[PDB]
Write an enzyme that holds these catalytic residues in place. Structure first.
Site, mmCIF file in Angstrom:
data_model
loop_
_atom_site.group_PDB
_atom_site.id
_atom_site.type_symbol
_atom_site.label_atom_id
_atom_site.label_comp_id
_atom_site.label_asym_id
_atom_site.label_seq_id
_atom_site.Cartn_x
_atom_site.Cartn_y
_atom_site.Cartn_z
ATOM 1 N N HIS A 228 3.775 11.092 6.274
ATOM 2 C CA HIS A 228 3.358 10.801 7.629
ATOM 3 C C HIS A 228 4.466 10.172 8.417
ATOM 4 O O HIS A 228 5.042 9.175 7.983
ATOM 5 C CB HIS A 228 2.140 9.846 7.655
ATOM 6 C CG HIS A 228 0.864 10.485 7.192
ATOM 7 N ND1 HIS A 228 -0.274 9.756 6.926
ATOM 8 C CD2 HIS A 228 0.553 11.783 6.960
ATOM 9 C CE1 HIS A 228 -1.235 10.587 6.548
ATOM 10 N NE2 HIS A 228 -0.757 11.823 6.545
ATOM 11 N N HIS B 185 0.817 -1.196 0.000
ATOM 12 C CA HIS B 185 0.000 0.000 0.000
ATOM 13 C C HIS B 185 0.856 1.253 0.000
ATOM 14 O O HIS B 185 0.443 2.297 -0.490
ATOM 15 C CB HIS B 185 -0.943 -0.005 1.219
ATOM 16 C CG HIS B 185 -1.516 -1.354 1.533
ATOM 17 N ND1 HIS B 185 -0.865 -2.270 2.332
ATOM 18 C CD2 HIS B 185 -2.664 -1.952 1.132
ATOM 19 C CE1 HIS B 185 -1.589 -3.373 2.414
ATOM 20 N NE2 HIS B 185 -2.686 -3.206 1.696
ATOM 21 N N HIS C 226 5.871 7.003 6.226
ATOM 22 C CA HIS C 226 5.333 6.502 4.941
ATOM 23 C C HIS C 226 4.702 7.635 4.166
ATOM 24 O O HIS C 226 4.683 8.782 4.608
ATOM 25 C CB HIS C 226 4.331 5.398 5.213
ATOM 26 C CG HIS C 226 3.130 5.859 5.954
ATOM 27 N ND1 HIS C 226 3.019 5.752 7.317
ATOM 28 C CD2 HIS C 226 1.982 6.440 5.525
ATOM 29 C CE1 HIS C 226 1.866 6.258 7.703
ATOM 30 N NE2 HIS C 226 1.221 6.682 6.640
ATOM 31 N N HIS D 193 1.712 9.063 1.166
ATOM 32 C CA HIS D 193 0.453 8.928 0.443
ATOM 33 C C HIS D 193 0.571 9.657 -0.869
ATOM 34 O O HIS D 193 0.944 10.857 -0.883
ATOM 35 C CB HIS D 193 -0.667 9.518 1.284
ATOM 36 C CG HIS D 193 -0.933 8.729 2.516
ATOM 37 N ND1 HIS D 193 -1.668 7.564 2.505
ATOM 38 C CD2 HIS D 193 -0.459 8.860 3.781
ATOM 39 C CE1 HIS D 193 -1.704 7.055 3.723
ATOM 40 N NE2 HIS D 193 -0.973 7.818 4.515
ATOM 41 N N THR E 236 -7.178 6.790 9.384
ATOM 42 C CA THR E 236 -7.993 7.026 8.159
ATOM 43 C C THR E 236 -8.528 5.770 7.458
ATOM 44 O O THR E 236 -9.113 5.845 6.355
ATOM 45 C CB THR E 236 -7.162 7.830 7.169
ATOM 46 O OG1 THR E 236 -6.100 7.008 6.697
ATOM 47 C CG2 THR E 236 -6.593 9.068 7.859
ATOM 48 N N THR E 237 -8.356 4.630 8.094
ATOM 49 C CA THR E 237 -8.864 3.372 7.622
ATOM 50 C C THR E 237 -9.341 2.568 8.844
ATOM 51 O O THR E 237 -8.953 2.885 9.983
ATOM 52 C CB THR E 237 -7.708 2.613 6.845
ATOM 53 O OG1 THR E 237 -8.219 1.413 6.260
ATOM 54 C CG2 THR E 237 -6.573 2.245 7.751
ATOM 55 N N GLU F 248 -4.298 12.922 1.861
ATOM 56 C CA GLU F 248 -5.510 12.597 2.579
ATOM 57 C C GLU F 248 -6.148 13.870 3.091
ATOM 58 O O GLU F 248 -7.348 14.076 2.935
ATOM 59 C CB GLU F 248 -5.190 11.669 3.738
ATOM 60 C CG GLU F 248 -4.821 10.256 3.290
ATOM 61 C CD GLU F 248 -4.685 9.344 4.484
ATOM 62 O OE1 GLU F 248 -3.914 9.715 5.376
ATOM 63 O OE2 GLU F 248 -5.355 8.299 4.552
HETATM 64 MG MG LIG Z 1 -0.727 7.663 6.700
#
Ligand SMILES: [Mg+2]
Length: 244
Positions: free
Chosen positions: A103, A54, A80, A82, A185-186, A90
């Site tokens: 992040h 991911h 990590h 995004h 966020t998940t 995000e």
């Molecule tokens: Mg993140």
């Protein structure tokens, strides 16, 4: 995403992330001072970097720590990214979505491990920064990292960096930020994440952004380009800033 609260009740909560940061609604809190970051400077050491299917995630040592206003100390765990390939970030700012969001995930030092902290109130803190592209040259603090993406093209592959400068991978100004209380966020969408979003941006070259977006494959062997969660209502929260 609409269905998440059925089985993950925290996802139906009032303090969900990500959010849109509307700067006209941000409250200046003069009692917020600095992030008080220690141990993020250039150093030798082992920095594992993995394609988890991911994202690319870089594991960080526990000598990287930040101290928030009330004195709570948060220990760095992992960094990590995004991205999209604008569809990357995000969080949005005044409705604008950015190309990449970085992040750095930390855990509260009052807990014995990251895994314990993840299910604890006030267990987590994330330092977030946006990337901006224009006509910028290569960001030299990303050069080794970007060069190693070619080594973790398939999910589960891993590579090591023997030196890194996390501080200088972040924006030049680390003094100014927005903060709010939010969540993962998940799912399970745990509402135990203290967010810090830097006001200044990281400058990458267009080539660097292209390489990040086009280097890694997922479990279906397709290039990684994943759907963000929509921004969530602030509800009773007010985003605060440590600058006017
Ligand atoms: Mg993140």
């Amino acid at each position: 995403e609409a269905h998440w609260p059925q089985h993950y009740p925290a996802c139906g909560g009032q303090r969900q992330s990500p959010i849109n940061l509307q700067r006209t609604k941000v409250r200046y809190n003069p009692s917020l001072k600095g992030l008080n970051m220690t141990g993020y400077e250039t150093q030798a050491g082992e920095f594992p970097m993995v394609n988890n299917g991911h994202t690319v995630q870089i594991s960080l040592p526990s000598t990287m720590r930040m101290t928030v206003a009330d004195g709570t100390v948060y220990i760095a765990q992992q960094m990590h990214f995004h991205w999209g390939g604008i569809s990357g970030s995000e969080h949005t700012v005044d409705g604008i979505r950015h190309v990449i969001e970085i992040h750095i995930v930390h855990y509260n030092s009052k807990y014995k491990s990251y895994d314990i902290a993840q299910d604890a109130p006030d267990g987590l803190a994330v330092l977030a920064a946006f990337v901006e592209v224009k006509n910028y040259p290569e960001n030299t603090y990303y050069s080794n990292f970007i060069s190693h993406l070619a080594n973790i093209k398939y999910p589960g592959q891993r590579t090591t960096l023997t030196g890194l400068d996390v501080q200088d991978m972040l924006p030049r100004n680390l003094q100014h930020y927005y903060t709010y209380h939010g969540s993962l966020t998940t799912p399970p969408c745990t509402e135990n994440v203290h967010w810090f979003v830097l006001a200044d941006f990281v400058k990458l070259s267009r080539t660097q952004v292209w390489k990040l977006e086009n280097s890694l494959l997922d479990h279906r062997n397709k290039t990684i380009h994943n759907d963000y969660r929509r921004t969530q209502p602030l509800n009773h929260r007010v985003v605060e800033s440590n600058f006017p």
